[PDB]
Design a protein around this ligand. Structure first.
Ligand code: HEM
Ligand code: O
Length: 153
């Protein structure tokens, strides 16, 4: 697909829509996650000892926000520049994943959880051209973090 001027315009537009509601979209995101894979729960300090996914836990919100931001930034950088750039932050990300017991097979869990979250976020404006655009941008960003975990192991 590439990432045409027209495709990037489509991701930016759809992310602005996500940030517009953090406590919802982030608690939804963790439920989509636990639906796709229940065992994932013991991983999260803020999920451990609990029985349900807390809805107003700042730790949880801060966490999930950071995750979508990073995927959007990735799409822009792809249209302008043609790539995703690896920095300090992505590198530290890779460390903390490993301390916490996270593996590669966990990633399609969080992808489908994000496509399904964005399909839910943009509703009727959904196009093939847009699905194509978020897919490209996640894929391209995961490729980069997985890279940094393996390196923190
Ligand atoms: C491109 C995809 C991903 C991005 C952009 C991302 C981003 C992040 C960030 C930014 C943090 C630190 C948050 C903090 O300091 O507050 C974090 C922590 C963490 N992540 Fe991920 N992540 C991704 C995929 C995954 C996957 C696939 C899993 C496994 C289910 C996972 C499990 C965790 C855990 C257990 C922590 C520690 C949280 C703690 O106990 O408090 N992440 N992630
Ligand atoms: O995460």
């Amino acid at each position: 697909g590439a990432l045409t001027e027209s495709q990037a315009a489509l991701v930016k537009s759809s992310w602005e829509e996500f940030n517009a509601n953090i406590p919802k979209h982030t608690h939804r995101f963790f439920i989509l996650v636990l639906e796709i894979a229940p065992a994932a729960k013991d991983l999260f300090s803020f999920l451990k000892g609990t029985s349900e996914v807390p809805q107003n836990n700042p730790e949880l919100q801060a966490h999930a926000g950071k995750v979508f931001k990073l995927v959007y930034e990735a799409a822009i950088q792809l249209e302008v520049t043609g790539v995703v750039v690896t920095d300090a932050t992505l590198k530290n990300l890779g460390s903390v994943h490993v301390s916490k017991g996270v593996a590669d097979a966990h990633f399609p869990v969080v992808k489908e959880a994000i496509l399904k979250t964005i399909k839910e976020v943009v509703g009727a404006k959904w196009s093939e051209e847009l699905n194509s655009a978020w897919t490209i941008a996640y894929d391209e960003l995961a490729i980069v973090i997985k890279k940094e975990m393996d390196d923190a192991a």
